[PDB]
From Swiss-Prot, chains A, B:
CoA binds at residues 53-60, 306. PROSITE patterns: CHALCONE_SYNTH. PANTHER family: CHALCONE SYNTHASE 7 (PTHR11877:SF62), HYDROXYMETHYLGLUTARYL-COA SYNTHASE (PTHR11877). Signal peptide: none annotated. GO terms for molecular function: naringenin-chalcone synthase activity. This is Chalcone synthase 2. Homodimer. It comes from the Eukaryota. Belongs to the thiolase-like superfamily. Chalcone/stilbene synthases family. Keywords: Acyltransferase, Flavonoid biosynthesis, Transferase. It comes from Medicago sativa. Changing residue 301 to A/D/N/T: Drastically reduces catalytic efficiency. The primary product of this enzyme is 4,2',4',6'-tetrahydroxychalcone (also termed naringenin-chalcone or chalcone) which can under specific conditions spontaneously isomerize into naringenin.
């Protein structure tokens, strides 16, 4: 009796990305002049050596601009947020418990419009953020804000960190594939109000986050068994993995404290990622008989430019493999979990725009990686779609 | 090519609970004398009317004792934790980022011993808590503490609230069923260091949490396709749902602030649960042709005794249906997400102890419910196992 129920309940084909929409706070913050702004707004003009280090960090970041909910007016009204370490969680939380779902809604509406089907057909909702927590969560807020059915099955992923663009895909794959008819709205939405803080010369690692983190949200519709010529596949998920790199304890830490979310880098993250990326690639692609990593399309979380440079160096990737990744890092900075989903959007849009054969830059197979605390690597093996 | 991969990758039978282990902080806190202790340790002896209200709340709670990490010594060393609203998140976080995984490890070791198979066969790990957050999370800590493989696939569920015993089961079902060979360790671990606070006479709702919340962890092993006579099924999952009750906005709220995790009750939760439980039951059991709710075995989150009493009243359940639920509420109080998993353990152990025909009190089908913020109801339809 349960065998028959199980058989009828499950989907049949691979989880597929059917729509992608993104959104960012309207405030565009130029990187070239950020050092000057940031040292002024934090009342840190007298830390001249630290300022010169930050200017160097920003000039090497390979980020031209970021979008930030935080403005000069907001920062003036919250001096504790501008100090390196002052009680400020309540103020930050008040900002992000609202802005995370507001921004996620904007991205989600775009994805739902692209999908083109009734929102009442969304059966599952995954919401992911590293900024702020609340009860009921941002998943409940987004259900109310979008008018989803009350029986949407929710997955609230909080405080995950940068690898979680990969995690939401690994999660969505199983929800979609094990449930016939399931249609999963996936929303990653990240806002740096929780991480922004002033500079301190004995905390240079913290300072790196101030050069790299940006705001944004991305939404997907994921489903198996797409209805031919109603729904339009963009990418198919085939296999996923998550692992912890050896010898990386405490490489990236982040505590949610009375002074907001801190950020620490205690180890060489670019070196750890680069030393462990081959292992991740042969786990994923050796069963498919592929060993040429220039023959697949690439999406990599751009935690900072050095991760990308060292990966490309280690593997001998052609410089163009990381073009889609670098273009997102350039125009939006590191948006934690959302980043990789902006990169999928950029790649399929550019592939379509340029008349390539597939959504994966003309190639059949591809890989998406998330990197973050642990040190954690998430791997998602993708197959592109024709046209 | 992907069709063949998909076909080979998925499991075939229903997700099954193969082992359950639980654990609690060693400190046993008697309810009869709690009012006296709590008003003294919080320096609230002069709030005589409030004290009499709390004594009534504890005497009606139907809780005989709870286990708490917090002790008199710890409370003396943290006066801010004893005030109704004082900066104390950092201190609370320091307690629970350690104790959540420590306690989860204790429960997990018990479940793994019962399961009897190598821990290297755990492929997925779900960790769930409403107390504290950190990066890397309690899932990373539990992977290190237990010596799981580094490539265990982790699901960190933070700040979820009381319905999440149901949520981890809904999640584990899809992971197990869509992945051949998958074996999911599920750990809910809850510690009231984050919620404990002193009493305030204009915040009586908050005070209810102080009479009801307790500490504990529960762990499960979940898998499809149990290996005959190596692995031993206890309960099978068949169907799941999550929904938001109408007219319940703001019924239960909880914010993670500089003063720790607050708790508010703005609506009649027992009444909302009772008015919406029938709908949840016919969604679940009308497709199975069952309408007699005394004919199934019951597991219900015991948020407080009034929820149970009003459910039993609304449906005309025989008083014995809630025996397993009430026994856990009596001996451990409300342990948020872990509660329902302690109740499954109690029911299968008592059914086995008393020589009943099935693990579900001698009955074939059963239901598990979680209730929490939203107002959210999680439903899990279960099938028992013979013997
Ligand atoms: O908009 C956002 C963009 C990026 C971030 C990053 C936060 C973060 C904080 C850490 O301690 C660890 C880290 O791995 C990630 C948060 C918000
Ligand atoms: O050990 C524990 C036992 C219970 C709890 C409950 C916390 C909680 C706080 C709220 O604001 C909302 C609520 O629904 C749940 C936390 C720890």
């Amino acid at each position: 009796s349960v065998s028959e129920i199980r058989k009828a309940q499950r989907a049949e084909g691979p989880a597929t990305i059917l729509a992608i929409g993104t959104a960012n706070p309207a405030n565009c913050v130029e990187q070239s002049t950020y050092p000057d702004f940031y040292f002024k707004i934090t009342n840190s003009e007298h830390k001249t050596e630290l300022k010169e280090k930050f200017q160097r960090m920003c000039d090497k970041s390979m980020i031209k601009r970021r979008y930030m909910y935080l403005t000069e007016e907001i920062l003036k009204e919250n001096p504790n947020v501008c100090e390196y370490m002052a009680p400020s969680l309540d103020a930050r939380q008040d900002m992000v418990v609202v802005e995370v779902p507001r921004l996620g809604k904007e991205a989600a509406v775009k994805a739902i419009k692209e999908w083109g089907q009734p929102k009442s057909k969304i059966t599952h909702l995954i919401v992911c953020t590293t900024s702020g927590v609340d009860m009921p969560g941002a998943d409940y807020q987004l259900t109310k804000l979008l008018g989803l059915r009350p029986y949407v099955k929710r997955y609230m992923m909080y405080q995950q960190g940068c690898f979680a663009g990969g995690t939401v895909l690994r999660l969505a794959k199983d929800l979609a594939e094990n449930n016939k008819g399931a249609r999963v709205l996936v929303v990653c939405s990240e806002v740096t109000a929780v991480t922004f803080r002033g500079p301190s010369d004995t905390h240079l690692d913290s300072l790196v986050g101030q050069a790299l983190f940006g705001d944004g949200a991305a939404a997907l519709i994921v489903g198996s068994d797409p209805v031919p010529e109603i729904e339009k596949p963009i990418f198919e998920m085939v296999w996923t993995a998550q692992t912890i790199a050896p010898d990386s304890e405490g490489a990236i830490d982040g505590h949610l404290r009375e002074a907001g979310l801190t950020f620490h880098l205690l180890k060489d993250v670019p070196g750890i990622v680069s030393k462990n990326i081959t292992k991740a690639l042969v786990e994923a692609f050796e069963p498919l008989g592929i060993s040429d990593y220039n023959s697949i399309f690439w999406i990599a979380h751009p935690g900072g430019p050095a991760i990308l440079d060292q990966v490309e160096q280690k593997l001998a990737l052609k410089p163009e493999k990381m073009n889609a990744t670098r273009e997102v890092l350039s125009e939006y900075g590191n948006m934690s979990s959302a980043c990789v989903l902006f990169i999928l959007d950029e790649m399929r849009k550019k592939s379509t725009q340029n008349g390539l054969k597939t959504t994966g830059e003309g190639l059949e197979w591809g890989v998406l990686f998330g990197f973050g605390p642990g040190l954690t690597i998430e791997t998602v093996v993708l197959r592109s779609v024709a046209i």
